[PDB]
Write an enzyme that holds these catalytic residues in place. Structure first.
Site, PDB file in Angstrom:
ATOM      1  CG  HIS A  50      -0.612  -0.548   2.400  1.00 32.49           C
ATOM      2  ND1 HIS A  50      -0.164   0.175   3.487  1.00 32.49           N
ATOM      3  CD2 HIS A  50      -0.543  -1.862   2.734  1.00 32.49           C
ATOM      4  CE1 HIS A  50       0.088  -0.689   4.473  1.00 32.49           C
ATOM      5  NE2 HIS A  50      -0.099  -1.919   4.012  1.00 32.49           N
ATOM      6  N   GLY A  93       4.038   6.738   9.335  1.00 35.05           N
ATOM      7  CA  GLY A  93       5.390   6.631   8.804  1.00 35.05           C
ATOM      8  C   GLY A  93       6.137   5.334   9.206  1.00 35.05           C
ATOM      9  CB  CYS A 102       3.697   1.278   7.081  1.00 33.03           C
ATOM     10  SG  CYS A 102       2.090   1.391   7.912  1.00 33.03           S
TER      11      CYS A 102
END
Ligand SMILES: *[C@@](O)(c1nc2cc(F)ccc2s1)[C@H](C[C@@H]1CCNC1=O)NC(=O)[C@@H]1[C@@H]2[C@H](CN1C(=O)[C@@H](NC(=O)C(F)(F)F)C(C)(C)C)C2(C)C
Ligand SMILES: *[C@@](O)(c1nc2cc(F)ccc2s1)[C@H](C[C@@H]1CCNC1=O)NC(=O)[C@@H]1[C@@H]2[C@H](CN1C(=O)[C@@H](NC(=O)C(F)(F)F)C(C)(C)C)C2(C)C
Lengths: 306, 306
Positions: free
Chosen positions: B41, B143, B145
């Site tokens: 994603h 941030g 991820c």
């Protein structure tokens, strides 16, 4: 969100750890530029440490009695000096993995990360505070001496602690990187007491702010209080007195939450006087005092280093 | 002695973190050999993630839409593949800092270390457990991820988790390094519930053993119990059932303390039924279930890696 005891990344310190042997004693040392730092009692043997005369001991000692290994590779020691409770061994090879670094002596209530090491190899990393009574509550076995505590400021490593001993109460004591103990401790095997510990009030407040920031606000009451009045209750629970410097340091968290320090203090007073009632705050059933305002700011803003 | 939530040293993983950008979205990726892994994603934008069709999105996407940076240095992407919920970007440069490594899918109740990262730079490291309901209680901001969770076996890094999302209850969810979620989660912005969490009984026992080993033995009572009977009380408090595999895994701690698992169970039953009475165990006022037997063994034996 979420809230964890977070340590600094340990990569830059890992490249600095070595093994230092003198006879049968092995501990850890720290290899920066062409110098290795370790506890001077590497030169003592396990069973005669009641009251060493370090000067006399060190005098039977030559450069070649010191076996320094970085992984497999042996380093040649070309010089040795005792500084307070640390030995400094000049070696012939600058560590190519030396980070930018400084040596600092931290203040009671500051936090730092410990890279717990055995035989010069990293076992684990955790975060700790320098208690008001200059102990730390670490996790340290036989062989851990010479493990270091540090902070990272961007790319710079600030070394602040070297491990030396465990006190009867199961807490830990050690020096700065100049060899000077935090607290009144000395490096001999004798009964030694830390005084009464106190709670680091400003830290507890920062942690209450982190709680609020994370949505855990059950404990916020409808009162306020005065510095003076707060401090009357503080003293009775062995909390450090709060000063206006503390108030001002909490300013970012204050501003970010909209809750004035003295309101948060009032909440804290009630928690001190009525306990938590079996509830938790950020998953804890006790009041946590090992996160500085700075720590909280960064875990709630995402500060990075490498 | 002393007992701390200890993380693995993070050096070997720090050298593998990079920044991955697709339009305005930036997250972290993991650079091993000539491949970068990140959450798929990365190819979505912040405000349209309610229900992405990842296949369609990925189809507007070419190698050159992907900006991969390791520090200053940009890497050239020569190939891209979607695997479950992860994107794999083939790059033209093998990471020279790649450790020996494998990919493992961990089991509920195992622990691992998280290197929390922002913009491809390490912020901090902490230890976590995979909960029975396949969440983790991490500390993760916007941030984060692409931050990874891992173990070290000697010199080998086992990657077991990649961060993806925070669930309404403030716990965290993510995948293995093949892109498959732990738990029933999916990578879209929709209300998603974890089921009821349970306590990891075998871990609580290991932690009771660590307590004993450290001299904290107040809670040891004068009873024993049966697996069956213990399990009757376990179930009522949302403790995982204990099996004989668990009993056998605790064998080292059992042997080292002289206290049979079923005795320790009896002690635990009373703590469950009467609470701690405002006392603490290893400084905690709750029962800790995020240390495996293996963890306890190593913090009480000094296991090293580098
Ligand atoms: C560390 O790793 C060191 N070990 C040795 C072994 C030798 F043979 C020579 C020098 C050294 S330094 C020890 C770390 C502790 C072991 C258990 N938990 C630890 O943190 N440090 C020491 O053993 C230390 C050294 C002599 C006696 N030490 C103690 O830590 C002892 N405590 C005390 O006597 C006191 F005062 F209570 F604190 C003890 C009883 C072993 C825990 C010296 C202080 C030089
Ligand atoms: C992570 O760093 C990512 N951020 C972005 C930003 C983009 F623009 C594109 C892709 C990504 S992945 C986020 C980490 C969380 C932020 C707050 N705490 C974190 O752990 N992950 C996400 O934002 C994640 C992605 C979309 C919605 N996500 C959520 O974590 C959201 N939760 C949920 O919707 C659910 F189901 F409740 F879990 C939310 C509400 C932002 C916390 C997707 C799941 C792909």
């Amino acid at each position: 969100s979420g809230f964890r005891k977070m340590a600094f990344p340990s990569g830059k310190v890992e490249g600095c750890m070595v093994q230092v042997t003198c006879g049968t004693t092995t501990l850890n040392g720290l290899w920066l530029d062409d110098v290795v730092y370790c506890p001077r009692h590497v030169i003592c043997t396990s069973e005669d440490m009641l009251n060493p005369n370090y000067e006399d001991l060190l005098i039977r000692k030559s450069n070649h009695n010191f076996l320094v290994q970085a992984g497999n590779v042996q380093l040649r020691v070309i010089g040795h000096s005792m500084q307070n409770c640390v030995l400094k061994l000049k070696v012939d090879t600058a560590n190519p993995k030396t980070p930018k670094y400084k040596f600092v002596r931290i203040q009671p209530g500051q936090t730092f990360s410990v890279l717990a090491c055995y035989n010069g190899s990293p076992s684990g990393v955790y975060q700790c505070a320098m208690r008001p009574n200059f102990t730390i509550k670490g996790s340290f076995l036989n062989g851990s001496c010479g493990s270091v505590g540090f902070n990272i400021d961007y790319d710079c490593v600030s070394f602040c602690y070297m491990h030396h001993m465990e006190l009867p109460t199961g807490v830990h004591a050690g020096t700065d990187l100049e060899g000077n103990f935090y607290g009144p401790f000395v490096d001999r095997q004798t009964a030694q007491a830390a005084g009464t510990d106190t709670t680091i009030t400003v830290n507890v407040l920062a942690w209450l702010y982190a709680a609020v920031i994370n949505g855990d606000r059950w404990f916020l009451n409808r009162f306020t209080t005065t510095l003076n009045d707060f401090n009357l209750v503080a003293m009775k629970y062995n909390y450090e007195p709060l000063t206006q410097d503390h108030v001002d340091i909490l300013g970012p968290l204050s501003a970010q939450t909209g809750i004035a320090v003295l309101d948060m203090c009032a909440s804290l007073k009630e928690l001190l006087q009525n306990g938590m009632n079996g509830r938790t705050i950020l998953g804890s059933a006790l009041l946590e005092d090992e996160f500085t305002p700075f720590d909280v700011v960064r875990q709630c803003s995402g500060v990075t280093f490498q």
